[PDB]
């Protein structure tokens, strides 16, 4: 074992990248400087390197952790500045990390305790919304997912349709994700821009066990209507879901 030890070397910032960090630290408190043509060049170095390191599918958690540590040692303001840069799609490292199921890196970002986890990308979605649909295979990962849910607003509504993370999870029949969202305070009575609830999404898609889980929520209101007056019960009938429909009638009236 020890004679066969393979040391992983620390990753270190390039000269140009460390220079950009030091430049940013001195102008972080001068908004005029930050807005200048010349300073856009250093900001470009920052964003290009950081996204290359943090946000590819193949991203190395040890490299991201070394970078976080190096930024921190330049300045905590530099660390919080870089961690929350968004590219031209409005995506942060936390959006890409989550999307890739790179949960070690998600864990690193949350642990910096400088991450804004409620940031909407250009598509209009938060990292929690992306997480609702991200592949998860080990239980160690679902713990990071639940940390992410805990650290931000699970009740945010997306710019397109006002959908919620709970609605996205319901619509994919992701019971594991519905449970974690519920456990972290997702409100089941939020309505999207058309008046739909998660209960209605579950009736549309026929997810019987999700319907049970939503109805098991203490304040769940099965009487809400969408903009057209449709109810969860009426939707279940229209979509041909006779057993969901009986479940819903029985809960409204027992």
């Amino acid at each position: 074992e020890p004679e066969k030890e393979e040391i992983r070397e620390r990753y270190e910032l390039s000269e140009k990248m460390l220079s950009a960090c030091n430049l940013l630290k001195y102008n972080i408190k001068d908004p005029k400087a930050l807005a200048s043509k010349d300073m856009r060049i250093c900001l470009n170095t920052l964003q290009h390197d950081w996204f290359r390191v943090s946000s590819q599918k193949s991203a190395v958690p040890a490299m991201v952790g070394d970078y976080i540590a190096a930024f921190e040692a330049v300045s905590p303001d530099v660390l919080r500045y870089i961690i929350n840069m968004a590219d031209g799609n409005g995506n942060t490292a936390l959006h890409y990390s989550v999307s890739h199921s790179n949960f070690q890196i998600v864990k690193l970002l949350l642990d910096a305790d400088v991450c804004n986890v409620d940031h909407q990308n250009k598509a209009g979605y938060t990292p929690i919304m992306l997480a609702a649909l991200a592949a998860v295979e080990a239980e160690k990962d679902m713990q990071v997912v639940e940390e992410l849910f805990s650290c931000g607003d699970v009740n945010a509504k997306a710019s397109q349709a006002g959908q919620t993370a709970l609605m996205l999870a319901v619509s994919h029949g992701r019971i594991d994700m519905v449970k974690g969202l519920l456990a972290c305070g997702a409100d089941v009575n939020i309505q999207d821009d058309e008046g739909s609830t998660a209960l209605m999404c579950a009736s549309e898609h026929g997810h019987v066990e999700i319907v049970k889980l939503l109805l098991a929520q203490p304040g769940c209101n099965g009487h809400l209507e969408d903009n057209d007056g449709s109810t969860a019960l009426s939707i279940a009938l229209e979509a041909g879901h006779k057993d969901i429909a009986v479940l819903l009638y029985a809960h409204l009236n027992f």
């Binding site: 979605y125 996205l168 999404c201």
Partner: peptide
């Protein structure tokens, strides 16, 4: 008839990128 958000099954790629 997919003319309401609740009837759609959105995509991971739709969540990450728009225009």
């Amino acid at each position: 008839p997919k003319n309401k958000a609740r009837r759609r099954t959105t995509t991971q790629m739709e969540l990450l990128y728009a225009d």
